[PDB]
Amino acid sequence: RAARARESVDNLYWFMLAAANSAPDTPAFVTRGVRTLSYRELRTRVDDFAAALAELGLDVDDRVVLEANVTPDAVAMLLACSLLGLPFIPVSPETPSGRLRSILDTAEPALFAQAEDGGRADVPATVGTARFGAGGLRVERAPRARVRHRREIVGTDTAYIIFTPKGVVMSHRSVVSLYRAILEQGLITPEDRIATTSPLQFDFALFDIGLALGTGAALVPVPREELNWPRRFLAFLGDTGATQVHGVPSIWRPVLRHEPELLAGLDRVRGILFGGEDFPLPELRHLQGLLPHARIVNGYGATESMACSFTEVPRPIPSDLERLSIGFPLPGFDVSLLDEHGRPVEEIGVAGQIHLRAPSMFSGYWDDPEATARVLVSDPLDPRSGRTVLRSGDLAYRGEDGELYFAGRVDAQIRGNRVEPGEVERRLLEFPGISAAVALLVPVLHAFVVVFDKAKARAFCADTLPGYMIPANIVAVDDIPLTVNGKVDRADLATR
Amino acid sequence: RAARARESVDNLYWFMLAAANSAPDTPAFVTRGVRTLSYRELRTRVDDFAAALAELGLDVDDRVVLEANVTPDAVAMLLACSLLGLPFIPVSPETPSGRLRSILDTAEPALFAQAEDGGRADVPATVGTARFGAGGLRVERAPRARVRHRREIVGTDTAYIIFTPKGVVMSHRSVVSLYRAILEQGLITPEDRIATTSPLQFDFALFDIGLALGTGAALVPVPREELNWPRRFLAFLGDTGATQVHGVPSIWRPVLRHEPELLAGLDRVRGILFGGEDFPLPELRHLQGLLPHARIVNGYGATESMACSFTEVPRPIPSDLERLSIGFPLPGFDVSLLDEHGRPVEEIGVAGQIHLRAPSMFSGYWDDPEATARVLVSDPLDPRSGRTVLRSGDLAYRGEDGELYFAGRVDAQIRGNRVEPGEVERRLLEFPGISAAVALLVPVLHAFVVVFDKAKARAFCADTLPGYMIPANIVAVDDIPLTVNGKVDRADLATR
Ligand SMILES: Nc1ncnc2c1ncn2[C@@H]1O[C@H](COS(=O)(=O)NC(=O)C[C@H](N)c2ccccc2Br)[C@@H](O)[C@H]1O
Ligand SMILES: Nc1ncnc2c1ncn2[C@@H]1O[C@H](COS(=O)(=O)NC(=O)C[C@H](N)c2ccccc2Br)[C@@H](O)[C@H]1O
């Protein structure tokens, strides 16, 4: 009685499980005692979860909150939801109770599902509850009764909604279009094992999962408790035979600081992919020199299109390079840089706001048509057609070869001088004893460093940097704090 | 210097010319002395036209008016425009000068192109002019100078704009999604020769072209001057070895009236496809009985998605059948019937307004965001996501098996009784001497018939029909008048 997506219609289920046919006994997951789960065994688990979910009587478009990190069972659940046209809302179990309640209030999901050993204890009676594990999907409280109205699942149906409360609605057509565009780049092969570090609630995790499974490669989910300690992290990558390591730049900071010798021993690592924020070039040059046979790729873009561009870093990174390129949009993507007059920037080295034409565009912000209209805007180069672009909120400029360079959030840019915090941080990272450095503007410029004479550090900055870029104050901190998704927590540093 | 669509990106060029690689010397066109043009020779002509167009310096999204009917040269031009990301605006040369000027005023195209022997003589100086033929694309007046701003062509770029002044903007992604969905139905094979009758300006012509060329079949364009005379029309289908005949129901009316014996001699015809309006069942039963080995398919939908459903008629058509089904939406399409309260209709036999979820959706109405917002509306079953549906303007109901039945335009539906003009016309078509019949409401009910005693014809209606369905007046006419696209011209009949 439940609708199911047809094989010919864009849908995560069919996209990620195609290798169960062409290579059933190849590994889809490697986990640690190292264990593998084949494509065939993954599809079996998806199909068993989907049979159980289909019993609950949910209509296509009914929302399922999936509280999990990246595991074989969580990926089996999101693929079962996919097949049934039930958009999933991934939430990491580290999400505070109040923030989850805020998501439940706005999203009004039919069902909340967590792992058998999950610890969420406080979900409202209107929301159904279930636990998933080895033993199948187990309903605790059934979702409320309803009538199904949707006969057939389409490509524009919602695959997932990313909540940060801002909810980015992605369609199956959009996410599959991003996977097809990156598969065309041959980043990885079926013999790769992709170590993924991002929380499931971050679309960088959903990118890694669909890249690996769509290619017929293996996914090696790195638990947060392994990632947080440098020798433990390196032993996990070695034991699992990871060939590719994906994550935000911060995943390398402890290893580079405490264990560079053991990092250099990861002889099977063929590639590193980072995204979500700038990689400090002194840290990136350190990593590149420890692993000379790992290709490093810089991934750029936003939840609103999943991503935009994937750009191999130069080998070696020029010692005087100020900014890595974010390259050229993927095939089928296009960028216009518009100035503050709404007009195209063609001039080399002049920043404008990225307006993106993408086949992977979000459907809209959940219950926020006004926010949608400010971001998905009429194409400024073709305003009479009805075609929309993503007004990205990002600045960038082009080089002599048409390649892009990211230039910060439009809304987050001293003495009539634009500060480049990356330039301040670069010069402090080059000061003897400084391991890490983050600069921020309260406008007053403070730097936080992981190690000390502040006065010697200021004069060292003043040797190369203009007056407006010299930090007013330099504060020693034990750690650079991170957001749940692994980005620099500048709001936390502002508090001290 | 001109941008060109990449092979991996949805685009008419790559879609329609794939067979130039897999089957270069197979026929793409059959024309009449019967001549063929191979896939390889078509791609050569497209590439030569595209090289010439690329010289003009147009930017992606710049509009090209293509004044032509369906010919190898016109199809080569629309594919050259496709490759360069220049949306084409197809206009039939039968379009009156005033109507073309109205289109030029609103669309503001960069270029107007017509055939070497075309007769349009009055195009404004701001619009560039060119003629295309055997001898290539020939510029008469260059388009105005501009700066190109678009670096890369995407799938959401506009392929064409259909003007009726209402302009339906279609994307390459949308039109290719319709072709892929119909290719999945195996209507035709590469050995088919598809006789196409629609003017190029009607998207039924664009459907036939992409179906044939996407399949690797041959297209047999039927000139209007061959279509208008029944023996001439039948000799053309026989000489060209047509295996499939596509067109609006009116293309059969003269043949059925004057030449049913010769129609029965079309031994190579394996299939008939009609769309755009109801086929009067007495005429459709006549045709089906003359050509018992031709499959007949009923195509339903609107320019706004190109089409929705393709439904083989029953063989034979039940003599008591009142309404042909419009079946089930294609794979990847979905219909909700909503009532006048905006709520889903689940009840068998109750009409509601078709709301369509389609991968082939139009981008919007040209320069009419208000009309766009009244037609591409928030999904009424999922209004908080941002997902849109097509509010079709069509009524339909479902049968016991979930199949649809078209029930007229919502806006165009006597004594507190809904009139079904098809029922009036059916009973008059069954009256001895009546060849054709059209009923219309001025509300006063008039019927126009092609042949006579009006009084005997009224009493014959009154034998089976309720009082409110008996025509007030019956007028003998020589011909049922048609619109340029071949539909019943009810506005013309209203004038008499
Ligand atoms: N390479 C980058 N360099 C510098 N800044 C970057 C970068 N990528 C994102 N950003 C910034 O993050 C913003 C996007 O933040 S986000 O919406 O949370 N998305 C992400 O961080 C991850 C992104 N969706 C993504 C997914 C999959 C693969 C790569 C990437 Br990037 C973007 O608009 C930029 O401001
Ligand atoms: N099969 C049908 N039976 C009865 N009515 C039909 C039918 N198809 C369209 N219509 C009516 O035409 C309307 C659409 O008019 S239109 O926008 O000019 N489109 C067409 O006539 C042709 C349509 N785009 C089409 C293209 C390609 C293949 C099939 C078809 Br149908 C539609 O909304 C219905 O009201």
Descriptive account of the structure:
The PDB classes it as ligase. The entry lists the keywords Hitachimycin, polyketide biosynthesis, ATP binding, adenylation, ligase. It forms a dimeric assembly. Two copies of one chain form a homodimer. With 496 residues, chain A is an alpha/beta fold. Chain A folds into two domains: 1-413, Rossmann fold, CATH 3.40.50.12780; 421-494, ANL, C-terminal domain (GMP Synthetase, Chain A, domain 3). Chain A has helices at residues 12-17, 19-22, 39-54, 72-83, 97-107, 172-183, 203-215, 224-227, 230-239, 253-258, 260-264, 281-290, 369-375, 421-429, 454-464, 490-494; strands at 27-31, 35-38, 64-67, 88-91, 111-115, 128-133, 136-141, 158-163, 167-171, 193-196, 218-221, 244-246, 271-275, 295-300, 309-312, 334-338, 352-357, 364-365, 376-378, 388-398, 404-409, 436-441, 445-450, 473-476. In chain A, strands 11-10-12-13-14-15 form a six-stranded mixed beta sheet, with helices on one face. Chain A has a five-stranded mixed beta sheet with strand order 4-3-5-6-7, covered by helices on one side. In chain A, strands 16, 17, 19, 20 and 21 form a five-stranded antiparallel beta sheet that branches. In chain A, helix 3 crosses helix 4 (72-83) and helix 6 crosses helix 7. Chain A is globular and about 75 Å long. Chain A starts with 11 loop residues before the first helix and ends with a helix. Bound molecules: ligand A1L0H (2 copies).
